[PDB]
Amino acid sequence: GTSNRDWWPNQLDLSILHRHSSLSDPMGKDFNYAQAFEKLDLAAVKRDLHALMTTSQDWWPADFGHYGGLFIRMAWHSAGTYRTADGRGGAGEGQQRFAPLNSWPDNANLDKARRLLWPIKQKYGRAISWADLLILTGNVALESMGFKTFGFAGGRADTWEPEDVYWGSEKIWLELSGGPNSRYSGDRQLENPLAAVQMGLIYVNPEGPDGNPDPVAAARDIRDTFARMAMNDEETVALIAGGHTFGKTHGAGPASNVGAEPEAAGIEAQGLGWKSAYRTGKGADAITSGLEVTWTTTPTQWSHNFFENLFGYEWELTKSPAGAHQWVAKGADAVIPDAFDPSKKHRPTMLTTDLSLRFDPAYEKISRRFHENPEQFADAFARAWFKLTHRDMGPRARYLGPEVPAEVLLWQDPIPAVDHPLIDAADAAELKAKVLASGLTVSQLVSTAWAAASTFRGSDKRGGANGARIRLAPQKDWEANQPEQLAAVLETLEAIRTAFNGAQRGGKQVSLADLIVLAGCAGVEQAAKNAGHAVTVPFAPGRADASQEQTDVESMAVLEPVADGFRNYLKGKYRVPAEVLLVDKAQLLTLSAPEMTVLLGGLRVLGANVGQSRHGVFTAREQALTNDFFVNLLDMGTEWKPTAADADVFEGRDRATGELKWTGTRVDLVFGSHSQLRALAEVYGSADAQEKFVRDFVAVWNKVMNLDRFDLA
Amino acid sequence: GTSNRDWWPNQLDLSILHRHSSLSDPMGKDFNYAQAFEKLDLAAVKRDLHALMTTSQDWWPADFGHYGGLFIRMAWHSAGTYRTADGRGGAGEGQQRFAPLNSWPDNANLDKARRLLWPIKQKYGRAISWADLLILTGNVALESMGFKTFGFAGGRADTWEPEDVYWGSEKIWLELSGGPNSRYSGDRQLENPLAAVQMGLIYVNPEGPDGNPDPVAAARDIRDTFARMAMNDEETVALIAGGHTFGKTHGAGPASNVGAEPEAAGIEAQGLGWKSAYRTGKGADAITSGLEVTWTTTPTQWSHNFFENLFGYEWELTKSPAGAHQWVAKGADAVIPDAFDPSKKHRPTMLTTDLSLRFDPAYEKISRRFHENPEQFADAFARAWFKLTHRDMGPRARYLGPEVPAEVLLWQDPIPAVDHPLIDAADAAELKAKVLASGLTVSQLVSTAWAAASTFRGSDKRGGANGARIRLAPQKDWEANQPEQLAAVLETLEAIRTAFNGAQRGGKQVSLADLIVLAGCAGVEQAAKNAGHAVTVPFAPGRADASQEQTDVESMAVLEPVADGFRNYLKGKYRVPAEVLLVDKAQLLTLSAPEMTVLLGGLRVLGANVGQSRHGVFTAREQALTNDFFVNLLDMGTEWKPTAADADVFEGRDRATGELKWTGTRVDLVFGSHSQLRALAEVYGSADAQEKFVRDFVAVWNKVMNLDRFDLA
């Protein structure tokens, strides 16, 4: 069936904004997963998981009698799709059970791991999500084999359809770099937002870069991909060596024996894939990656044998039974146990990427320290495993259950506890009137609150106005935030705060984070008033102010908006059209297409554009909250043409007189071009829509202001 | 960006069930279009439309100073996508303003027509939908030019994204037959459910079949396509000759001058398309179809000139200025006016497909009768125009406003008005006890009510249980309905009715239509009881019984299910896999994926399968309402393989013993294979979900029982 995508493959795709509707969810619209989880007997779930670790099923026999290794890899892969550039991927929505991730080559036989968990999932039902179960199972695997984890938080709600993520443009699974859709350019520069070296891999190729078994070059790819997953050199070494302390790889015969991935398999396979014609197709004959490596002498127990073997031997390049490159310890005894036959033993083996931990000079230093000090190794691995598997969970307020670590970590962008009474509705009214009496304009107030709140992204739940980090490095200096204007607004707001707080009794006070949001609310109310409408913009107090020392400035870098259509801002020239970047921002903000449309039309006429640009400011009453953007955009008495100077800027001229009326960007004019967006603009641009436009604008402004407010959840 | 569709282009697409969510709709979920329309000043809208007809805009000047012909074609095209096979297409959702229909070649320059209506749409806002406006504008164009319409009904609610329709598999616009995705096979057999000869056409090719100018062969395509749009020979002739009394075609220069369709055009085109480099690109220089034909001497007035010219002249094959085939009247004077230049006049011209009305023997007799009896032509065209433009509006109870024709038409599947008191809750209890005491089984009662209610389709709002048409030809004879078993259930129900009705006072009675549904509800209640649950199933009385004479047996043929996954029924072998057909049927029933899942799992265990097939009956307590379908399907202790005798039937065998436990179809197993469907099945298959399953099942059963109940809406 030929689709709109086939006819117009470059047209903007709005469906990504309309995912996760209540139509696709089988739970009541009332279902609260946090409340269900809070009543889960987590201890009982862990005891069941513990038993499962050594209860082999004959349809996928457990290596060494212990599923621990397999489950660790499962939880690692669930988490390891995460990219810092957009926060997409990660373990937080249990997306490994859906396409495409369920069928990535790197996820081969994790279909079997997930199926082994069905009986426990079935037993506990809605009180434990798949997303939480995958991570928990990983933790129980580690604990069952003698490793002390740093902790565990529940609260990852299940989802019911595939997330729309850009994983790359390649049309061939695992395509080597340099093809017609190469994700590499220049001196091996990986395209943002991607965080893996080949389509269908979690991070790097375990044979080495494009299959070239050089551990020094592999180290480069490791370092780059792991950084793009929020991990530094210490965390990377800890994770790889920690993981590869357990279990084994599977490459017992040629890869050609392996059939279709799950999404391609026949219906009868019941959601499993990679059915193998090699001998029994499982157990001792398993083929997963095609590599056949077992790293330690006790694959089912925590030890410091990974580094003892890495540094205790010299390594020789060899081939698995499936033909993959891998390494074997020169002149070693057969000291590594066989996964099924107690009478066989094998020499130590390693991947190319394992050897990176020794042959990269910076990794080597850390690996030596971890070798000499296995207690440091254990603690670094525990912390890194916690971080990895919880990186996309968002603020600490979302962490559920009795194993949540009490130590607050810098990577969490922590928010201090509130220790005083909150402002009430009458206090909020007084503060709004003071803000407005200061002489701050609607434009300044709206632009500042937008800048503070619109850092939120629903992908990993980072950002938002809580914390008042707009006043700290690096946010205060981001170009989109207009650093000089921002400084003058913040100074005036801080003087208002200091006076309000100084006047109170009982220790009531207002945070700067709250006041920034409230002040924007006052701006919106005033804009409505300027248009002849009396509205109260909702406001919920309770934000707190974080310090500079509680803010990792380097981690904060990935939240800088280089594209923000809502402020008509583009930091530079990009390959992706601006309107695509707008829909990407809207999705990160959790906005629907109608919410995106209302919000953008209102921001334009409030003065939110960076640098006071007139682009898309289609009104003669700037700073009044009206639907003028839509009425003027849709007026056929205007003709639009790209400018000679810049094809991405358009002039709107009266069709009769030739007089210049307006200018706009692609982000402005798309609402008059795209057939679904223009249908939305028409609603807001109709004669009966001024009151609806105001109400809808206020609702979406409030939604954006509260995106990070999991403390009120 | 490589998508799931690219990787696994044959995987089932569930997004079609989750369209039209409240996320994409800019109106509140409270918005009621019927109530908004009820308050529209329809008279005022029509006066503005009348004014519009001769208010020429310079960006698309009006032919002959009058846009009537253009607007008639617009309305005709809005309605003319309709297919009887599935009820999809038609005017009822205003889908002409979205992709792909906004950019079909046959809809060229209708973007201009719609844009001319923007100021009126704007002025009246939500009180008139685009969908209603398009048809109304057509009506006003006809009235403006002297033709009295049969009527007009509002109530077509606007939609906010493209409908997912199968329009054909061809990858080239207007591809001629016999290509690698040919919609034709055999003796010019058009594939169901299609109702046009080429991708991007409304019905046929105006040059003739695949561009061959033979009017007799063209007539065959016309007859077949129009039949598939619910039009017989009399309605077809009336429509074509009626329509082509007005206006003109546009082919002033070569088609190479015409640019990108709306969905391909530059952003600056602001939703418009087909920008032409031929001379002024518009008006006298317009290029639309590439044909250059004006049919009558008074193109802006109703006349009887179409048939006078058709029969009054002999016709010679010629070429338009764009090179298209068309016909000119042999030795005629220049009697046809020019659309722009009062000093030019033209000979009469016709399309191939117009000549079909004379050279096809059956059309010729009708065309001669219309030529000799212009009153009959008028009334037939008015009736056909009303039918065409309202065919997908559903039951009469949805027709709004003061122009609704009072005459009840057979094509409307009319339901007699109820003229008596309805049963109350005490009566409903007594009828259900009598039903259950009769000895009819759960399986009988469920199967009969499912058969009655599940004829509904939301695409054109035909079918459903109202009317009791299950007792009439042809439904009573359909194989899916199990005619012998059906007759025995209906006989026992009719006896129950006759006794209940005989015993009443005050003229209270129950329809057979109501009783069928109530009896099914008793079946479901009894099934719940069989499983140890106490459940009341909701029931809304008020259906009436239609007669045989009120049920057109030929029109009812297209609602026969050849595929009904909910009864594990397939009438023959098809090119579309069975699970695709299931999702298709779910969409027509207005079900979401979770609703489809729960409903199908419950029907399997209640005994709703046609022929009492065991396929998917995964329970040992048949006729008890449990979630056994899900628990057993998801049991990994069973391995599934296709049977040798039939690759579409599967055997589920114990993994340890090899013993046969169950058999299933693709419709059964898809719920264990597809990754989104299996996530749904898991929810209902969990240990905490038995109560949830029962309640959700009752909700969806009730939904289906009420699908056609617009009398209560």
Ligand code: HEM
């Ligand atoms: C450079 C980064 C990494 C690479 C290239 C890599 C590669 C691989 C490969 C190819 C396999 C074999 C799959 C098979 O055939 O069964 C595997 C197994 C494994 N990996 Fe990794 N890995 C990396 C990092 C990690 C991390 C960060 C963890 C966890 C902290 C982890 C834990 C494991 C475990 C437990 C197994 C054994 C699975 C089993 O016993 O069945 N790996 N790895």
Ligand code: HEM
């Ligand atoms: C055999 C079925 C039909 C065919 C092949 C056909 C074909 C065409 C074509 C090719 C055009 C010219 C488009 C252009 O170049 O601007 C046209 C115009 C038109 N058709 Fe049809 N038509 C059919 C049936 C109908 C019917 C059923 C109606 C209405 C009841 C209708 C009403 C019109 C009108 C009013 C125009 C004139 C448009 C204008 O003045 O701009 N046609 N038709």
Ligand code: NA
């Ligand atoms: Na994420």
Ligand code: NA
């Ligand atoms: Na329809």
Ligand SMILES: [O]
């Ligand atoms: O891994």
Ligand SMILES: [O]
């Ligand atoms: O037409």
